[PDB]
Amino acid sequence: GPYEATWESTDKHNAAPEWYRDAKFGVYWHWGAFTTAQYASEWYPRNMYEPDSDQRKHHTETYGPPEEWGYENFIKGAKDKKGNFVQFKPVLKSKGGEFDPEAIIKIVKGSGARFAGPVAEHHDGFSMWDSKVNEWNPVNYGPKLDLVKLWADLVRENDMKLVIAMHQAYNYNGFFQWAPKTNDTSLQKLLGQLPRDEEDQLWFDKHREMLDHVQPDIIWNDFSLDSPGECGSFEGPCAVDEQKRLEFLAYYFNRGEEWGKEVVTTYKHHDHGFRNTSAVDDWERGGPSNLVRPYWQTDDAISASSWSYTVGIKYYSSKAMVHSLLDRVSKNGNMLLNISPMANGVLPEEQIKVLNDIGDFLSRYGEAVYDTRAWDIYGEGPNQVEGGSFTAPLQGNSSDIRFTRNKEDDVLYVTVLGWPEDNLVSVKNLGSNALVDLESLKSVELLGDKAGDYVKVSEWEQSKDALDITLPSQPAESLAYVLKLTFDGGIPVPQPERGAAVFSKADATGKGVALALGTFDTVFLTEAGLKPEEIRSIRVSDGTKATLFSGFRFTGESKELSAGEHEVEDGSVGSIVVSKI
Numbered sequence: 001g002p003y004e005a006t007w008e009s010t011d012k013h014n015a016a017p018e019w020y021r022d023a024k025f026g027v028y029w030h031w032g033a034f035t036t037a038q039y040a041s042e043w044y045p046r047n048m049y050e051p052d053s054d055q056r057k058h059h060t061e062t063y064g065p066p067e068e069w070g071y072e073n074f075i076k077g078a079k080d081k082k083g084n085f086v087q088f089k090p091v092l093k094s095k096g097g098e099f100d101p102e103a104i105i106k107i108v109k110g111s112g113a114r115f116a117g118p119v120a121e122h123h124d125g126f127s128m129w130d131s132k133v134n135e136w137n138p139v140n141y142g143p144k145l146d147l148v149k150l151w152a153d154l155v156r157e158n159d160m161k162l163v164i165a166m167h168q169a170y171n172y173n174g175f176f177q178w179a180p181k182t183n184d185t186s187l188q189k190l191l192g193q194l195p196r197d198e199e200d201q202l203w204f205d206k207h208r209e210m211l212d213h214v215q216p217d218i219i220w221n222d223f224s225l226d227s228p229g230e231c232g233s234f235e236g237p238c239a240v241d242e243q244k245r246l247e248f249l250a251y252y253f254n255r256g257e258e259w260g261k262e263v264v265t266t267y268k269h270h271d272h273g274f275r276n277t278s279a280v281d282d283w284e285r286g287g288p289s290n291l292v293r294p295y296w297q298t299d300d301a302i303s304a305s306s307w308s309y310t311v312g313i314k315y316y317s318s319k320a321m322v323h324s325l326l327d328r329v330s331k332n333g334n335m336l337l338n339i340s341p342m343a344n345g346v347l348p349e350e351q352i353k354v355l356n357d358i359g360d361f362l363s364r365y366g367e368a369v370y371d372t373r374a375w376d377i378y379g380e381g382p383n384q385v386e387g388g389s390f391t392a393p394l395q396g397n398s399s400d401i402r403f404t405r406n407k408e409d410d411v412l413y414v415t416v417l418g419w420p421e422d423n424l425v426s427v428k429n430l431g432s433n434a435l436v437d438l439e440s441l442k443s444v445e446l447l448g449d450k451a452g453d454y455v456k457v458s459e460w461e462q463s464k465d466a467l468d469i470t471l472p473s474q475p476a477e478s479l480a481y482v483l484k485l486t487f488d489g490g491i492p493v494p495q496p497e498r499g500a501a502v503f504s505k506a507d508a509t510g511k512g513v514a515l516a517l518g519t520f521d522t523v524f525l526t527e528a529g530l531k532p533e534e535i536r537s538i539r540v541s542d543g544t545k546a547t548l549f550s551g552f553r554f555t556g557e558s559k560e561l562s563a564g565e566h567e568v569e570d571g572s573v574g575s576i577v578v579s580k581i
């Protein structure tokens with residue numbers, strides 16, 4: 001294909017294709033030999049060896065000292081201290097067992113997921129497809145099933161895009177740092193003890209083999225691609241060889257061309273291993289506090305404590321999952337949710353209930369989520385996420401709004417995260433302090449009990465503070481409620497209380513983009529709908545200043561502008577910093 005293994009070549013790949021931006025919600029699952037112990041977390045293979053750890057204590061009490069009863073015994077099978085045979089060995093329901101992958105995929109489809117798939121290989125050295133490059137796989141050992149192909153075929157049967165998650169970099173960058181050294185070269189491959197050049201080649205070879213095997217639409221990657229400092233006390237670069245990373249990107253993007261598919265690869269947003277030119281940034285167990293461009297995603301888990309099933313595990317509420325989805329989508333991201341089957345392949349009913357509830361929401365209110373795009377302001381209200389990876393899911397109430405809009409940019413969806421007891425929704429960013437003219441607001445509708453049904457909202461007034469909307473009769477109960485505001489000729493450009501707005505015409509009219517406090521480079525402004533060379537005026541809010549830069553990303557000649565309206569020379573702006581005074 002046309003891609004070469006260089007940054008410059010692979011940069012030209014379209015990172016986030018339109019189907020992926022339309023999709024919004026996906027589901028994957030950490031299920032593998034690391035689940036076998038059903039203890040602590042998916043890091044059990046690492047921590048069972050850790051000096052003085054609870055996991056080591058548990059392991060020693062249950063199986064044996066890890067120096068004798070090593071991690072590989074979960075894959076190959078061994079008796080525990082009470083004589084019970086232990087092995088990762090799911091058995092299909094069609095064979096009399098408890099593993100029903102078809103039922104799990106139907107549950108996932110029912111949740112509203114538009115992409116789905118397995119962790120194909122975590123940090124633990126176990127490839128879960130029929131692998132020639134890695135003998136540590138579930139066709140050779142355990143269930144004698146190509147689990148990744150089974151999942152992939154079922155995802156395609158059920159008309160979802162296929163995501164495959166790969167975490168095989170940390171395998172040799174410290175995950176197994178406390179495992180005994182071995183001279184068994186097969187066992188070295190499991191435990192990440194091969195020579196580093198061989199491990200770097202194996203990282204690529206695993207990707208190549210997997211992606212030719214199941215042709216994924218998205219390849220999700222974990223950290224240690226190039227994340228120095230993130231691999232704890234292990235002495236190493238916490239990285240994959242740069243050449244092998246580039247070979248992966250070129251190989252996958254070339255296969256995408258060959259297959260006639262727009263493919264996606266993701267990586268952890270703090271990791272430096274790929275570039276946000278051609279790969280999508282993934283925020284782990286969290287997401288930004290602000291609207292971020294370019295398009296990004298969250299991957300979060302149904303449990304706070306683990307990605308993989310453990311005995312006694314507790315789960316987030318449906319409310320937290322739906323409100324968090326709305327938050328990410330409003331901020332220009334997708335949300336990929338991890339679920340956690342037990343070692344025997346059963347999906348616990350508490351998890352099924354969460355997925356069912358998400359699906360009830362999306363099947364009713366999907367118009368406000370699927371196929372939408374972020375507005376320029378993501379939302380309003382007192383309940384907000386902290387921002388960053390490893391932060392708490394959102395749980396909001398009737399005081400909170402999240403915005404989305406249609407592709408035609410003349411419908412604004414106002415999603416309220418609870419039913420207002422006062423029967424009032426006040427939208428601050430559509431009030432007159434926001435300098436919003438509502439002459440073009442043609443209709444306000446409440447989305448009803450099933451998709452495509454609307455209840456007319458007849459009473460509203462625009463105050464200084466807000467567009468004050470009086471609600472019709474409460475529809476069937478739901479985790480959030482959606483107002484649909486339809487405009488003649490496009491949604492108005494709001495003036496943030498603190499922030500700015502930029503325009504394509506010289507007099508603060510025309511195409512516009514509202515900006516919060518923050519830093520907005522050429523990529524941001526372009527994706528928001530206004531190439532910076534087309535900016536011809538800016539309105540800076542009270543208590544705010546804006547600094548215009550000629551450069552792409554806060555370099556070059558700069559000019560500071562205080563509160564008020566200002567004309568801007570065509571082709572003079574590349575990026576903008578909006579700051580509180």
Ligand SMILES: *[C@@H]1O[C@H](CO)[C@@H](O[C@@H]2O[C@H](CO)[C@@H](O[C@@H]3O[C@H](CO)[C@@H](O)[C@H](O[C@H]4O[C@H](CO)[C@@H](O)[C@H](O)[C@@H]4O[C@H]4O[C@H](CO)[C@@H](O)[C@H](O)[C@@H]4O[C@H]4O[C@H](CO)[C@@H](O)[C@H](O)[C@@H]4O)[C@@H]3O)[C@H](O)[C@H]2NC(C)=O)[C@H](O)[C@H]1NC(C)=O
Pocket residue numbers: 226227228242243272
């Ligand atoms: C005190 O404060 C000062 C000022 O803030 C601190 O200085 C900063 O220190 C940084 C860390 O040393 C330094 O960043 C480095 O800059 C060099 C030159 O620009 C850059 O090459 C470095 O990037 C490499 O290393 C990082 C890990 O730090 C990797 O994440 C990265 O991928 C790069 O790895 C490549 O080079 C390595 C050799 O250095 C190879 O081992 C590695 O395999 C990889 O090689 C591949 O890629 C190459 C291209 O990247 C390619 O040529 C090669 O063939 C392979 O394909 C890193 O960014 C800052 O520049 C520096 N800042 C200033 C202003 O001086 C200082 O740390 C503070 N002190 C303390 C104690 O904290």
Ligand SMILES: *[C@@H]1O[C@H](CO)[C@@H](O[C@@H]2O[C@H](CO)[C@@H](O[C@@H]3O[C@H](CO)[C@@H](O)[C@H](O[C@H]4O[C@H](CO)[C@@H](O)[C@H](O)[C@@H]4O[C@H]4O[C@H](CO)[C@@H](O)[C@H](O)[C@@H]4O[C@H]4O[C@H](CO)[C@@H](O)[C@H](O)[C@@H]4O)[C@@H]3O)[C@H](O)[C@H]2NC(C)=O)[C@H](O)[C@H]1NC(C)=O
Pocket residue numbers: 275276277292293294519547553554555558577
């Ligand atoms: C996609 O990946 C790419 C590639 O990795 C990412 O690009 C990187 O983006 C970085 C963040 O923008 C950028 O760093 C910036 O580079 C400029 C140019 O060297 C530098 O001036 C920036 O430093 C300022 O900003 C940082 C915060 O980002 C501050 O910590 C720092 O003290 C500097 O602050 C000053 O400027 C800011 C404006 O940027 C002000 O907000 C701040 O208050 C302060 O203002 C004073 O100085 C101003 C003059 O500079 C003046 O106007 C003002 O009045 C004050 O006197 C920062 O280091 C990287 O260069 C860039 N890398 C590449 C290779 O392009 C990109 O972010 C990724 N995209 C996403 C979405 O993550």
Ligand SMILES: *[C@@H]1O[C@H](CO)[C@@H](O)[C@H](O)[C@H]1NC(C)=O
Pocket residue numbers: 182183
């Ligand atoms: C592993 O091989 C090295 C190299 O021959 C040798 O020095 C070491 O003793 C071997 N390890 C064990 C446990 O015998």
Ligand SMILES: *[C@@H]1O[C@H](CO)[C@@H](O)[C@H](O)[C@H]1NC(C)=O
Pocket residue numbers: 382383397398399
């Ligand atoms: C919603 O949450 C906000 C912030 O905690 C709180 O001030 C408000 O009273 C809550 N609304 C209801 C109806 O509980």
Ligand code: NA
Pocket residue numbers: 011012013014015277278
């Ligand atoms: Na690109």
